[PDB]
Write a protein that binds this ligand. Structure first.
Ligand code: LMT
Ligand code: LMT
Ligand code: LMT
Ligand code: A1IHO
Ligand code: A1IHO
Ligand code: A1IHO
Ligand code: GSH
Ligand code: GSH
Ligand code: GSH
Ligand code: PLM
Ligand code: PLM
Ligand code: PLM
Lengths: 139, 139, 139
């Protein structure tokens, strides 16, 4: 509980970020008059809508790495990457709300923080399994 | 294990609910003759299909809040909201299977239970971090 | 930490599998010249793209069952099913990259391993709640 509360706060902030992205896509449906179950519309509606679809798909990938890196490497370091990723996702959504070019940079900034979580999850898991394997192989 | 088994049961029930929604979308593909990878078809096929897409997107948001509220506020109270949300999602799918108007009410009933989980996650995290911050600031 | 490290490794491997599926869909966008936010294109682009959408949707369902079965039944047995599911998903993506028929078999092989995780989660939860219920009812 104590060693996972930063991971739980970054998690809740990520959920609130997804709520923001749903509020924005629901505004574009009223503005461009796009009626459900239609996902097609003007170039800008499809961009705002597509920005949300992508963020939603990446949300469990972010959660999985945040929790694994947080528990196997260091909670504060994984929660720091968790914020960097979530801020890059806000910028990605805001960029896609202007154009597809404008979303490119915050997409690579989010990919950056996501690879950082994967590296910390891998380093933490290797520091757990490897010493015991080195002992078994040498025995 | 003991303090998370209700959260794990509500989780498994949510997975079984997603299995039900996949069984229903696969029935609409045989009924309206919609062949994969096509996601377009009659107004009712797109509605059943779209109801499932939305539920799938919300599933990790539900899981994140259920587990955070369950561990930082109260397991039984978060599992109670977890059932309210899952029942509203069954009604949302059944409503969308009739029309887009008919899905509106169970969608706001699911949003209701989802905001309740977010409030309990926030209250639980504030009860953890705030006393220590009040002590540090006053020291 | 010790009793969840296999579940955390199978989790990280599932994240790396999703990274592979994104690398493949981004290759199809350059090859068939499909520009975002467009999700429509030649029959093969829509198949590679659709294979990824499905995998992404199933990822939290896999994570939920892997962790519940791993903690309530047996970590090694749930991690074994976790690998069977992830290998069937690689084959599903590779099959869909050829045709919709070719994806059918690895889709049922993934459904197989997913039902196995659900059964172990159910058996583990029943072994937890049922003895106490039998005692209460008989008392
Ligand atoms: C397969 C083998 C893997 C090879 C690994 C190669 C590692 C390269 C080592 C270079 C030196 C290490 O660099 C390490 O980076 C981390 C994360 O950015 C730093 O962390 C830093 O974050 C930011 C920079 O983004 C700063 O504002 C902050 O001052 C600091 O905390 C460490 O303070 C630094 O010591
Ligand atoms: C920023 C500050 C936040 C402000 C917070 C304002 C809180 C408002 C307080 C009103 C009184 C509290 O009301 C509290 O609600 C919960 C959840 O619905 C109740 O929980 C209830 O659930 C349902 C009602 O839906 C009943 O069938 C059941 O009898 C009861 O358990 C508590 O029994 C009640 O005490
Ligand atoms: C509602 C009531 C539920 C009814 C449950 C019915 C269960 C049927 C019992 C049949 C016998 C049990 O069969 C049990 O299956 C598991 C999982 O495949 C085996 O596990 C096996 O996996 C693979 C086979 O896929 C083998 O390579 C390996 O040798 C072995 O570990 C057990 O070694 C076996 O004992
Ligand atoms: O579950 C549903 C179903 C219907 C759709 C919504 C309901 C209306 N939404 C908002 C967003 C918002 O933004 C505040 C911010 F951005 F600060 F979070 N404010 C007011 N309504 C967002 C989508 N939703 C939802 C989604 C995620 C959640 F976490 C949640 F709690 C509710
Ligand atoms: O993984 C896959 C890949 C192919 C598609 C399916 C396989 C066929 N489906 C069903 C649903 C059902 O409903 C029983 C209820 F509703 F009680 F759950 N009964 C029989 N088959 C659902 C979709 N699937 C799947 C999905 C989620 C799961 F949890 C799971 F275990 C399997
Ligand atoms: O977050 C984002 C945003 C932009 C898109 C990508 C960035 C480029 N991708 C790849 C994949 C790959 O495959 C190595 C394998 F397959 F071994 F994982 N190699 C090099 N780049 C995958 C999609 N991404 C991403 C997704 C999941 C991750 F886990 C991650 F770390 C990053
Ligand atoms: N994905 C939605 C989440 C919130 C929402 O309103 N969901 C459903 C409510 S039935 C919706 O309107 N989806 C759009 C559609 O059905 O095409 C968004 O980003 O706005
Ligand atoms: N999203 C599916 C999940 C189950 C399923 O059959 N998935 C794939 C199997 S390749 C599918 O048919 N997806 C529809 C498509 O490919 O357009 C549903 O709700 O039916
Ligand atoms: N779903 C993507 C994930 C990686 C990616 O590039 N995501 C966004 C970057 S804005 C994308 O290009 N999505 C396709 C689109 O916007 O239509 C894939 O499988 O390639
Ligand atoms: C789906 C993200 C991973 C799940 C979180 C890991 C569970 C922590 C238990 C450690 C004791
Ligand atoms: C992805 C949902 C949140 C993950 C579940 C929290 C892990 C619990 C560990 C507490 C000790
Ligand atoms: C979202 C997948 C389930 C979350 C993982 C369960 C948390 C484990 C805590 C056990 C102590």
């Amino acid at each position: 509980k104590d060693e996972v509360a930063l991971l739980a706060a970054v998690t809740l902030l990520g959920v609130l970020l997804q709520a923001y992205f749903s509020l924005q896509v629901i505004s574009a449906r009223r503005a461009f008059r796009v009626s459900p179950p239609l996902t097609t519309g003007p170039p800008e509606f499809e961009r705002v809508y597509r920005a949300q679809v992508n963020c939603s798909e990446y949300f469990p990938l972010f959660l999985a790495t945040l929790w694994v890196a947080g528990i196997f490497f260091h909670e504060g370091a994984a929660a720091l990457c968790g914020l960097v990723y979530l801020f890059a996702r806000l910028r990605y959504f805001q960029g896609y709300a202007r154009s597809a070019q404008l979303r490119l940079a915050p997409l690579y900034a989010s990919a950056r923080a996501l690879w950082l979580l994967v590296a910390l999850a891998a380093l933490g898991l290797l520091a757990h399994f490897l010493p015991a394997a080195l002992r078994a192989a040498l025995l």
